[PDB]
Amino acid sequence: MDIGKKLLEAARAGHDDSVEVLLKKGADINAKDNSGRTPLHVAALNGHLELVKLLLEKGADINARDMFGLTPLHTAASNGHLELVKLLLEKGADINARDEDGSTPLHLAASNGHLELVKLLLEKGADINAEDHSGTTPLHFAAKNGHLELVKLLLEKGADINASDFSGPTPLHSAAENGHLELVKLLLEKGADINARDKFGKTPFDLAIDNGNEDIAEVLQKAARSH
Amino acid sequence: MSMDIGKKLLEAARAGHDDSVEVLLKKGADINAKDNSGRTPLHVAALNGHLELVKLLLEKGADINARDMFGLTPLHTAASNGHLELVKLLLEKGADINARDEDGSTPLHLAASNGHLELVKLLLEKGADINAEDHSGTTPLHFAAKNGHLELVKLLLEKGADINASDFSGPTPLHSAAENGHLELVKLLLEKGADINARDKFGKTPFDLAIDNGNEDIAEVLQKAARSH
């Protein structure tokens, strides 16, 4: 009889009484379903605050990751559960945790227009200009999804209004990528930007590595250290 | 038997047979006849570096700025193929030095891509835009660096090429707001100083995205912002 599965279902449907019973029967409090979600994840999802208090006190992992790298805090913030987010932060949740796509809880809360929840996150030290793996910030999602007041807040709190993620490759990118060593040295001496990011957010150094250009990568690495 | 004389003129010009070209022109072949790719005798002659044949074509009134199917001018193809004396002649007879083909490439783009140093020197001397962007936002320096032409890159940098040229960017919040028809958000972003000239990954402005999505009110607001300046 799979009691971990029963624990997960009870946690999701918010049956505190069944959760108590199953945990007493030795159910794994950090049992993971097929998507890697723990009882804490699914309880956080449906805003079951008291159940989350019980799970945390009984040893649930606050920073557990599902297969997408989402923490319970991600899910609570995404679904606009303010008090639940307060609780998670008080119990040691990582406010700048990033999922598989590089999204922070602030990203998700901004995307869904949860104004007060965003206020709380910023108060508790959320990075307002955090970029996901696509180089996009919470302000991008708030503007894209038409959350006007939320955009006002982000701008008031110092979000970059012209945040534009990455750029196209610079000449140093091209030279590094195509293994032109002497060209790379010339570009560096003439002041090319070693920190430039191409359309995937990559530096000339990353591209040198991707293409197996050991000598170029060393020269670029040396440049990085000098600064 | 049958043989179109314009096609004979094109074949002769491509193979560099000045004597056949002279005869065909006297017999009334169209000096600006185009092949199936839109190339004129001037194009195909510039391609194979037939200088005297290009001189004859020009003196007999060839269209120096004719365009092939790719929007390439004779100057484009002479520059790309590194025919320096031929490029001199074309420029002297009025070729547009900053002409752009279908992809937004200028003659300097193509000469730089192939590392034709003295040819690039000449183009710059005659006023080529060293920081010209093609439709991808790419500059001549990009192509020289990418294709590994060291001395060309040295020259371009000497002549003021932007060493950190990076074309376009990802979309700004103003882009997203305009693309998704959020008018009040657009108005707010503008008053708070959003950049109306910002270009997204395809080089488009927020105004372009507004038109693309049929958001007229937003496009009008962005237009008023642009005109304001």
Coordinates of C-alpha atoms in Angstrom, one line a residue:
Chain A
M1 CA 0.0 0.0 0.0
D2 CA 1.8 3.1 -1.3
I3 CA 1.4 5.5 1.7
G4 CA 3.7 8.1 0.1
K5 CA 1.2 8.5 -2.8
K6 CA -1.6 8.8 -0.3
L7 CA 0.4 11.5 1.5
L8 CA 0.8 13.5 -1.7
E9 CA -2.9 13.3 -2.6
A10 CA -4.0 14.2 0.9
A11 CA -1.5 17.1 0.9
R12 CA -2.8 18.4 -2.4
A13 CA -6.5 18.1 -1.6
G14 CA -5.7 19.7 1.8
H15 CA -6.8 17.0 4.1
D16 CA -4.9 17.9 7.3
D17 CA -6.4 14.9 9.2
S18 CA -5.3 12.3 6.6
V19 CA -1.8 14.0 6.4
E20 CA -1.5 13.6 10.2
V21 CA -2.6 10.0 10.0
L22 CA -0.3 9.1 7.2
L23 CA 2.7 10.8 8.7
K24 CA 2.1 8.9 11.9
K25 CA 2.1 5.7 9.8
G26 CA 5.6 6.6 8.7
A27 CA 4.9 8.2 5.3
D28 CA 7.9 9.9 3.8
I29 CA 7.2 13.6 4.3
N30 CA 9.4 14.4 1.4
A31 CA 7.9 11.8 -0.9
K32 CA 8.0 12.9 -4.6
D33 CA 5.3 12.3 -7.2
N34 CA 6.1 11.7 -10.9
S35 CA 6.8 15.4 -11.4
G36 CA 9.2 15.5 -8.4
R37 CA 6.7 17.5 -6.3
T38 CA 6.7 17.0 -2.5
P39 CA 3.7 17.2 -0.2
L40 CA 5.1 20.7 0.6
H41 CA 4.9 21.6 -3.1
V42 CA 1.4 20.6 -3.6
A43 CA 0.2 22.0 -0.3
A44 CA 1.9 25.3 -1.3
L45 CA 0.1 25.1 -4.7
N46 CA -3.4 25.1 -3.3
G47 CA -2.7 27.6 -0.6
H48 CA -3.2 25.2 2.3
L49 CA -1.5 27.3 5.0
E50 CA -2.1 25.2 8.1
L51 CA -1.0 22.1 6.2
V52 CA 2.2 23.8 5.3
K53 CA 2.8 24.8 8.9
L54 CA 2.3 21.1 9.9
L55 CA 4.6 19.9 7.1
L56 CA 7.4 22.3 8.0
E57 CA 7.3 21.5 11.6
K58 CA 7.4 17.8 10.8
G59 CA 10.5 18.2 8.7
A60 CA 9.5 18.9 5.2
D61 CA 12.3 20.3 3.0
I62 CA 11.6 24.0 2.4
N63 CA 13.8 24.3 -0.6
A64 CA 13.0 21.0 -2.3
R65 CA 13.0 21.1 -6.1
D66 CA 10.5 19.5 -8.5
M67 CA 11.7 18.3 -11.9
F68 CA 11.4 21.8 -13.2
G69 CA 13.5 23.2 -10.3
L70 CA 10.5 24.9 -8.7
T71 CA 10.5 25.4 -4.9
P72 CA 7.4 25.6 -2.8
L73 CA 8.1 29.4 -2.6
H74 CA 8.0 29.6 -6.4
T75 CA 4.5 28.0 -6.4
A76 CA 3.2 30.1 -3.5
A77 CA 4.4 33.3 -5.2
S78 CA 3.0 32.2 -8.6
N79 CA -0.4 31.5 -7.1
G80 CA -0.5 34.7 -5.1
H81 CA -0.7 33.1 -1.6
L82 CA 0.6 36.1 0.5
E83 CA 0.5 34.7 4.0
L84 CA 1.8 31.4 2.8
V85 CA 4.7 33.3 1.2
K86 CA 5.3 35.1 4.5
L87 CA 5.4 31.8 6.3
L88 CA 7.8 30.2 3.8
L89 CA 10.2 33.2 4.0
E90 CA 10.1 33.0 7.8
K91 CA 10.9 29.3 7.7
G92 CA 14.1 29.8 5.6
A93 CA 12.9 29.8 2.0
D94 CA 15.5 31.0 -0.6
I95 CA 13.9 34.2 -2.0
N96 CA 16.1 34.2 -5.1
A97 CA 15.8 30.6 -6.0
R98 CA 15.8 29.9 -9.7
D99 CA 13.9 27.2 -11.5
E100 CA 15.1 25.3 -14.6
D101 CA 14.3 28.3 -16.8
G102 CA 16.1 30.7 -14.4
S103 CA 12.9 32.2 -13.0
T104 CA 12.8 33.6 -9.5
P105 CA 9.6 33.7 -7.3
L106 CA 9.5 37.4 -8.1
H107 CA 9.4 36.6 -11.8
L108 CA 6.3 34.4 -11.4
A109 CA 4.5 36.8 -8.9
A110 CA 5.2 39.7 -11.4
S111 CA 3.9 37.6 -14.3
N112 CA 0.6 37.1 -12.6
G113 CA 0.1 40.7 -11.3
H114 CA 0.2 39.8 -7.5
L115 CA 0.9 43.4 -6.3
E116 CA 1.1 43.0 -2.6
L117 CA 3.0 39.7 -2.8
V118 CA 5.6 41.4 -5.0
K119 CA 5.8 44.2 -2.4
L120 CA 6.6 41.6 0.2
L121 CA 9.2 39.9 -2.0
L122 CA 11.0 43.2 -2.6
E123 CA 10.8 44.0 1.1
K124 CA 12.4 40.7 1.9
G125 CA 15.3 41.3 -0.5
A126 CA 14.1 39.9 -3.9
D127 CA 16.4 40.9 -6.7
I128 CA 14.2 43.3 -8.8
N129 CA 16.4 43.1 -11.9
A130 CA 16.9 39.3 -11.8
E131 CA 17.2 37.8 -15.3
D132 CA 16.0 34.3 -16.3
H133 CA 18.0 32.2 -18.7
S134 CA 16.4 34.2 -21.6
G135 CA 17.8 37.4 -20.0
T136 CA 14.3 38.7 -19.1
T137 CA 13.3 40.5 -15.9
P138 CA 10.2 40.5 -13.7
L139 CA 9.2 43.9 -15.3
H140 CA 9.2 42.2 -18.7
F141 CA 6.6 39.7 -17.5
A142 CA 4.5 42.3 -15.7
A143 CA 4.4 44.5 -18.8
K144 CA 3.8 41.6 -21.2
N145 CA 0.9 40.3 -19.2
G146 CA -0.6 43.8 -18.8
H147 CA -0.3 44.3 -15.1
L148 CA -0.2 48.1 -14.9
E149 CA -0.1 48.8 -11.2
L150 CA 2.5 46.1 -10.8
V151 CA 4.6 47.8 -13.5
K152 CA 4.3 51.1 -11.6
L153 CA 5.6 49.5 -8.4
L154 CA 8.6 47.8 -10.2
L155 CA 9.5 51.2 -11.7
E156 CA 9.2 52.9 -8.4
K157 CA 11.4 50.3 -6.8
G158 CA 14.1 50.8 -9.4
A159 CA 13.5 48.3 -12.1
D160 CA 15.3 49.1 -15.4
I161 CA 12.6 50.4 -17.7
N162 CA 14.6 49.6 -20.8
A163 CA 15.8 46.2 -19.8
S164 CA 16.5 44.4 -23.1
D165 CA 18.2 41.1 -22.1
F166 CA 21.0 40.0 -24.5
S167 CA 22.4 41.4 -27.8
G168 CA 23.6 40.1 -31.1
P169 CA 27.3 38.9 -31.2
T170 CA 30.2 41.3 -31.2
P171 CA 33.2 41.0 -33.5
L172 CA 35.1 39.4 -30.5
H173 CA 32.3 36.8 -30.4
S174 CA 32.7 36.0 -34.1
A175 CA 36.5 35.8 -33.9
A176 CA 36.4 33.6 -30.8
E177 CA 33.8 31.3 -32.2
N178 CA 35.6 30.8 -35.5
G179 CA 39.0 30.2 -33.9
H180 CA 40.9 33.3 -35.1
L181 CA 43.5 33.7 -32.3
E182 CA 45.5 36.6 -33.6
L183 CA 42.2 38.4 -34.3
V184 CA 41.1 37.8 -30.8
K185 CA 44.3 39.3 -29.4
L186 CA 44.0 42.3 -31.6
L187 CA 40.4 42.9 -30.6
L188 CA 41.3 42.7 -26.9
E189 CA 44.3 45.1 -27.3
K190 CA 42.0 47.6 -29.0
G191 CA 39.4 47.4 -26.3
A192 CA 36.8 44.8 -27.2
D193 CA 34.3 43.9 -24.5
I194 CA 35.0 40.5 -23.0
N195 CA 31.7 40.6 -21.1
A196 CA 29.5 41.1 -24.1
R197 CA 26.6 38.6 -24.4
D198 CA 25.3 37.2 -27.6
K199 CA 21.7 36.2 -28.4
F200 CA 21.9 33.2 -26.1
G201 CA 23.5 35.3 -23.3
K202 CA 27.0 33.9 -24.1
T203 CA 30.3 35.6 -23.8
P204 CA 33.2 35.2 -26.4
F205 CA 34.8 32.9 -23.8
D206 CA 31.8 30.6 -23.7
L207 CA 31.9 30.4 -27.5
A208 CA 35.6 29.7 -27.5
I209 CA 34.9 26.7 -25.2
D210 CA 31.9 25.5 -27.3
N211 CA 34.1 25.3 -30.4
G212 CA 37.1 23.7 -28.6
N213 CA 39.4 26.6 -29.0
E214 CA 41.6 26.1 -26.1
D215 CA 44.2 28.9 -26.8
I216 CA 41.5 31.5 -27.4
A217 CA 39.7 30.5 -24.2
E218 CA 43.0 30.9 -22.2
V219 CA 43.6 34.3 -23.6
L220 CA 40.1 35.4 -22.8
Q221 CA 40.3 33.9 -19.3
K222 CA 43.5 35.9 -18.8
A223 CA 41.7 39.1 -19.9
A224 CA 38.9 38.4 -17.4
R225 CA 41.4 38.0 -14.5
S226 CA 43.3 41.2 -15.3
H227 CA 40.2 43.4 -14.7
Chain B
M1 CA 17.9 29.2 -86.1
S2 CA 16.6 30.9 -83.0
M3 CA 18.7 32.5 -80.3
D4 CA 17.7 35.6 -78.4
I5 CA 20.3 38.3 -78.9
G6 CA 19.9 39.6 -75.4
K7 CA 20.9 36.2 -74.2
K8 CA 23.8 36.2 -76.6
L9 CA 24.8 39.6 -75.3
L10 CA 24.7 38.2 -71.7
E11 CA 26.7 35.1 -72.6
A12 CA 29.3 37.2 -74.4
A13 CA 29.6 39.7 -71.5
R14 CA 30.0 36.9 -69.0
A15 CA 32.8 35.2 -71.0
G16 CA 34.5 38.5 -71.6
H17 CA 34.3 38.5 -75.4
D18 CA 34.4 42.2 -76.2
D19 CA 34.3 41.6 -79.9
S20 CA 31.0 39.7 -79.8
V21 CA 29.5 42.3 -77.4
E22 CA 30.4 45.1 -79.9
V23 CA 28.7 43.3 -82.7
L24 CA 25.6 42.4 -80.6
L25 CA 25.2 46.0 -79.5
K26 CA 25.4 47.2 -83.1
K27 CA 22.8 44.7 -84.1
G28 CA 20.6 46.3 -81.4
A29 CA 20.8 44.1 -78.4
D30 CA 19.4 45.7 -75.2
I31 CA 22.4 46.9 -73.3
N32 CA 20.4 46.4 -70.1
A33 CA 19.1 43.0 -71.0
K34 CA 18.7 40.8 -67.9
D35 CA 19.2 37.0 -67.5
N36 CA 16.9 34.7 -65.5
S37 CA 18.5 36.0 -62.3
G38 CA 18.1 39.6 -63.3
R39 CA 21.8 40.1 -64.0
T40 CA 22.7 42.6 -66.8
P41 CA 25.8 42.3 -69.0
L42 CA 27.3 44.8 -66.6
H43 CA 26.6 42.5 -63.7
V44 CA 28.1 39.4 -65.3
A45 CA 31.1 41.4 -66.7
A46 CA 31.8 42.8 -63.2
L47 CA 31.6 39.3 -61.8
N48 CA 34.4 38.0 -64.0
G49 CA 36.5 41.1 -63.7
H50 CA 36.3 42.1 -67.4
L51 CA 37.4 45.6 -67.2
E52 CA 37.6 46.7 -70.8
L53 CA 34.2 45.0 -71.5
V54 CA 32.8 47.0 -68.6
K55 CA 34.3 50.1 -70.1
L56 CA 32.6 49.4 -73.4
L57 CA 29.2 48.6 -71.7
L58 CA 29.4 51.9 -69.8
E59 CA 30.3 54.0 -72.7
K60 CA 27.4 52.5 -74.7
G61 CA 25.1 53.6 -71.9
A62 CA 24.7 50.7 -69.5
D63 CA 22.7 51.3 -66.3
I64 CA 25.4 51.5 -63.7
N65 CA 22.9 51.0 -60.9
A66 CA 20.9 48.2 -62.3
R67 CA 19.7 45.6 -59.7
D68 CA 19.7 41.8 -60.0
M69 CA 17.1 39.6 -58.3
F70 CA 19.0 39.9 -55.0
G71 CA 19.2 43.7 -55.3
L72 CA 22.9 43.5 -56.1
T73 CA 24.4 46.3 -58.2
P74 CA 27.4 45.8 -60.4
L75 CA 29.4 47.6 -57.7
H76 CA 28.4 45.0 -55.2
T77 CA 29.6 42.2 -57.3
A78 CA 32.9 43.9 -58.3
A79 CA 33.6 44.7 -54.7
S80 CA 32.7 41.2 -53.5
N81 CA 34.9 39.6 -56.0
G82 CA 37.8 42.0 -55.3
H83 CA 38.1 43.6 -58.7
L84 CA 39.7 46.9 -57.6
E85 CA 40.2 48.7 -60.9
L86 CA 36.6 47.7 -61.9
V87 CA 35.3 49.2 -58.6
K88 CA 37.3 52.4 -59.4
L89 CA 35.6 52.7 -62.8
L90 CA 32.1 52.0 -61.5
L91 CA 32.4 54.7 -58.8
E92 CA 33.8 57.1 -61.3
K93 CA 30.8 56.6 -63.5
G94 CA 28.4 57.2 -60.6
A95 CA 27.8 53.9 -58.8
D96 CA 26.0 54.3 -55.4
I97 CA 28.7 53.4 -52.9
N98 CA 26.2 52.8 -50.1
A99 CA 23.7 50.8 -52.2
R100 CA 22.1 48.0 -50.3
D101 CA 21.0 44.6 -51.7
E102 CA 18.0 42.5 -50.5
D103 CA 19.7 41.7 -47.2
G104 CA 20.8 45.2 -46.5
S105 CA 24.4 44.5 -47.4
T106 CA 26.5 47.4 -48.9
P107 CA 29.5 46.9 -51.2
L108 CA 31.8 47.5 -48.1
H109 CA 30.1 44.6 -46.3
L110 CA 31.0 42.2 -49.1
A111 CA 34.5 43.5 -49.7
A112 CA 35.1 43.3 -45.9
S113 CA 33.7 39.8 -45.7
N114 CA 36.2 38.6 -48.3
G115 CA 39.2 40.5 -46.9
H116 CA 39.9 42.7 -50.0
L117 CA 42.0 45.2 -48.1
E118 CA 43.0 47.7 -50.8
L119 CA 39.5 47.5 -52.2
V120 CA 38.0 48.4 -48.7
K121 CA 40.6 51.3 -48.5
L122 CA 39.2 52.7 -51.7
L123 CA 35.6 52.3 -50.7
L124 CA 36.3 54.2 -47.4
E125 CA 38.1 56.9 -49.4
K126 CA 35.1 57.4 -51.6
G127 CA 32.8 57.7 -48.7
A128 CA 31.5 54.2 -47.8
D129 CA 29.7 54.1 -44.4
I130 CA 32.1 52.1 -42.2
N131 CA 29.4 51.4 -39.6
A132 CA 26.6 50.5 -42.1
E133 CA 24.2 47.8 -40.7
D134 CA 22.6 45.1 -42.9
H135 CA 19.1 43.9 -42.2
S136 CA 20.5 41.7 -39.5
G137 CA 22.1 44.7 -37.8
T138 CA 25.5 43.5 -38.8
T139 CA 28.4 45.7 -39.8
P140 CA 31.3 45.2 -42.2
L141 CA 33.7 44.7 -39.2
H142 CA 31.5 41.7 -38.1
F143 CA 32.1 40.0 -41.4
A144 CA 35.9 40.8 -41.4
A145 CA 36.3 39.5 -37.9
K146 CA 34.1 36.4 -38.4
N147 CA 35.9 35.4 -41.6
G148 CA 39.3 36.0 -40.0
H149 CA 40.7 38.9 -42.0
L150 CA 43.2 40.3 -39.5
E151 CA 44.7 43.2 -41.6
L152 CA 41.2 44.3 -42.8
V153 CA 40.0 44.4 -39.2
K154 CA 43.0 46.5 -38.2
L155 CA 42.2 49.0 -41.0
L156 CA 38.5 49.2 -40.1
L157 CA 39.3 49.9 -36.5
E158 CA 41.8 52.6 -37.6
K159 CA 39.0 54.1 -39.6
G160 CA 36.6 54.3 -36.7
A161 CA 34.6 51.0 -36.9
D162 CA 32.7 50.3 -33.6
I163 CA 34.6 47.5 -32.1
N164 CA 31.7 46.5 -29.9
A165 CA 29.0 46.5 -32.6
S166 CA 26.2 44.2 -31.4
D167 CA 23.2 44.7 -33.8
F168 CA 19.9 44.4 -32.1
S169 CA 18.7 43.5 -28.6
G170 CA 15.9 41.5 -26.9
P171 CA 12.5 43.3 -26.5
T172 CA 12.0 46.0 -23.9
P173 CA 9.0 46.2 -21.7
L174 CA 7.6 48.8 -24.1
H175 CA 7.9 46.2 -26.9
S176 CA 5.9 43.6 -24.9
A177 CA 3.3 46.2 -23.9
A178 CA 2.8 47.3 -27.5
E179 CA 2.9 43.8 -29.0
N180 CA 0.2 42.6 -26.6
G181 CA -2.1 45.6 -26.9
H182 CA -1.7 47.1 -23.5
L183 CA -2.4 50.8 -24.3
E184 CA -2.5 52.2 -20.8
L185 CA 0.8 50.4 -20.0
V186 CA 2.3 51.9 -23.2
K187 CA 1.3 55.4 -22.1
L188 CA 2.8 54.8 -18.6
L189 CA 6.0 53.4 -20.0
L190 CA 6.4 56.4 -22.3
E191 CA 5.8 59.0 -19.6
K192 CA 8.4 57.1 -17.4
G193 CA 10.9 57.3 -20.2
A194 CA 10.8 54.1 -22.1
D195 CA 12.9 54.1 -25.3
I196 CA 10.7 54.3 -28.4
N197 CA 13.7 53.6 -30.7
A198 CA 14.6 50.3 -29.0
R199 CA 15.0 47.4 -31.5
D200 CA 14.0 43.8 -30.8
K201 CA 15.6 40.6 -32.1
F202 CA 14.3 41.3 -35.6
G203 CA 15.3 44.9 -35.4
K204 CA 11.8 46.1 -34.9
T205 CA 10.6 49.0 -32.7
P206 CA 7.6 49.0 -30.4
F207 CA 5.7 50.9 -33.1
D208 CA 6.4 48.2 -35.7
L209 CA 5.1 45.5 -33.3
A210 CA 2.0 47.6 -32.7
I211 CA 1.2 47.8 -36.4
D212 CA 2.0 44.1 -36.8
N213 CA -0.6 43.2 -34.3
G214 CA -3.2 45.7 -35.5
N215 CA -3.1 47.8 -32.4
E216 CA -3.9 51.2 -34.0
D217 CA -4.4 53.3 -30.8
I218 CA -1.0 52.2 -29.5
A219 CA 0.7 52.8 -32.8
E220 CA -0.8 56.3 -33.0
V221 CA 0.4 57.1 -29.4
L222 CA 3.9 55.8 -30.3
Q223 CA 3.8 57.9 -33.5
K224 CA 2.9 61.0 -31.5
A225 CA 5.9 60.3 -29.2
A226 CA 8.2 59.9 -32.1
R227 CA 7.0 63.1 -33.9
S228 CA 7.2 65.0 -30.6
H229 CA 10.9 64.8 -30.8

